[PDB]
């Protein structure tokens, strides 16, 4: 559902098809992971464990929410007294002694399930975010020569931090294609330095011991303890510099360091009441509507600061006799004896209220600059209260219309067209329900994917004849065999209907 | 001739005017490097 | 039926029928239909409030409690922050209410020592509940007619 | 109105030509053709 949504209302319309193939090639990886989750001691135990806490991933999440909506409520009984049981934050329970302790046992739990959320994410979702990136390096070298012909961007960050992985002899760890290093050597090859690309893509002894793996296959030596040196430390630094950039493993970090800290003031456990608005499918929508128009919100709060600066300069150069702070005589606390003192009357008691610096600055009935005060107040009232606090309504009240539109193009362009060809609902309605047929037995997303898993499973010598063609064209990447404009009914529409 | 035909890709322009015989006809011609070079500068692009 | 028989006991319970009008008048149903249609998005946004003013309550109780007051009579009676749950019911009856913010009901802070911690605490409150949340509750109504 | 007026362009310069006036349709009887009709046939620039 999510993939279909974000390919019709962004920049597709030509290259959408390669995205669909890219969609297939990582659901391929996702289904393999799910199958795998459904000293000998160490081994067995490690596995069974990491695999209960990677299927029970969503339950442990909601439980954290319930446990914090609890502990937060047990805090609304704190009280303060100058005489103890300096001021003492003792607990004013509902007479019964059963609250001072339970708050001591629902804190330690809130810091165990928090540990599983981290361990759990590190095995359910991390393998995929590596696959989606290890795939790009191979494709941007085989067909573009990113690190052979040119320089990546000379400015980007995720285009040169990955220069640290090509040299290690373990580059293809997840992307299936454990040869993404020999068949680039042959395409560029002669035109570039054959003897120098033999080492800049790691893989030493290539120019000498190329066909060395010709005799036979040896056996690896088992062992333990000493195996802790076979760590390609350089590759680990690279992946451990990628996961710390993902927006997910840093909203999981700030859960852990709020709870451990809470063990120091027990009030920091308040920040979780603030995850609600990050779950409840509905709440995300509302907040999404607020954040979507968000530069237009920050810069319009900006334009304010400056409008009240021009009102401050006019007040300071003329009207400062009208400001006051006391009835006690001798004129104390005149709020305009300095600039910057004056600019912080115009925001705390300025843009606030609902009438204007007009209600906090004496009255001006006794002539001498009178009709310069009424004109100064009325133009202020319209130009900040009525307009600028109506724009901050408009940028919100409009955003719901745009987000509910964008969610009514899909549901009306995935019900009036195909998604492989591009024909209409019309043509295919010359007979009893045909559009409901064209996308249940003819074209039909699914069917096209399960092909890409038939070809892989079957042996090579037996591919029929209309498969060896669509498997010598997924390898090279020349997607032309998709119909994209023609249909079996359309071509043979007289030879027999 | 996949060298000549590839090297002279960004140098020939194809036009589809209609005239004389009341029929569609194609036109081919040549454009210099400087002629195209003074087209992708940001000032002209925003004017487009 | 059970409002009328009951009315035979206090004759004021007969008020509930003035409330069927909005269930007839073909027009009135339309308006009210527009309100009720976006109705989970309304209940959960009143929700999101309760929690925002909880974060402002925890920050008030842990720092600013000397600025709250209730009398000129000396000996400091009625300090409205001496308990949580008492403090959380100043922030709704005299809190989200009015049109300026707990800023107009909590002494003034001109005499230094945590001053620019009060002005930053009030301005961010004014925008984050009055200007935004009471505009979202309006946007969910104006859009429903569309 | 203003974000409307800015969503007629981006939907009428992606569903029509600008020299002729034909649709995105007709030109989609083959592999990508509308992306061709405005890269080698009609194509603003070339005419200038
Ligand atoms: N090949 C296709 N071309 C066009 N539309 C398709 C194709 N395959 C599926 N669909 C769309 O998906 C719908 C039928 O599948 P399905 O009912 O699974 O969609 P869904 O309701 O989004 O998913 P689900 O029913 O699993 O919630 C139809 O509305 C159809 O337009
Ligand atoms: N002759 C033409 N007829 C119709 N549309 C054209 C024509 N020439 C260009 N276009 C439009 O411009 C787009 C392709 O050119 P280009 O990508 O330069 O447009 P742009 O994105 O507005 O400009 P730029 O890419 O320089 O920012 C297409 O969307 C296409 O519809
Ligand atoms: C050999 N092969 C695979 O093994 C493969 C794949 N996509 C996923 N896998 C696993 N493709 C496209 C592929 O060519
Ligand atoms: Ca065979
Ligand atoms: Zn089809
Ligand atoms: Zn054209």
Author numbering:
A (entry chain C): 4215 to 4252, 4541 to 4587, 4626 to 5037
B (entry chain D): 4167 to 4214
C (entry chain B): 4796 to 4941
D (entry chain D): 4942 to 4989
Q: What does the article say, verbatim?
A:
The molecular target of diamide insecticides is the ryanodine receptor (RyR), a large ion channel expressed in the membranes of the sarcoplasmic and endoplasmic reticulum (SR and ER). RyRs govern the release of Ca2+ into the cytosol, driving multiple events, including muscle contraction. Diamide insecticides directly engage and activate insect RyRs, causing uncontrolled Ca2+ release, leading to tonic muscle contraction, paralysis, feeding cessation, and eventually, death of the insect. Therefore, we designed a series of insect-like chimeric RyRs that contain the diamide-binding pocket from Sf RyR and the remaining parts from rabbit RyR1 (rRyR1).
To determine whether these resistance mutations reduce binding affinity or cause structural changes that modulate channel gating, we recombinantly expressed and purified chiRyR-I4657M/G4819E and solved its cryo-EM structure at 3.6 Å resolution. The binding site was resolved at a local resolution of 3.2 Å. Additionally, G4819E introduces a net negative charge and alters the charge distribution of the pocket. The structures of chiRyR-I4657M/G4819E, regardless of the presence of CHL, all adopt a closed pore. This is unexpected because they were obtained in the presence of known RyR activators, including Ca2+, caffeine, ATP, and CaM1234, which typically result in a large proportion of open channels in the case of rRyR1. Thus, the exact identity of the residues in the pVSD, which contains the binding pocket, has a significant effect on channel gating. Our structure revealed that these mutations alter the local structure and polarity of the diamide-binding pocket, leading to the reduction in binding affinity.
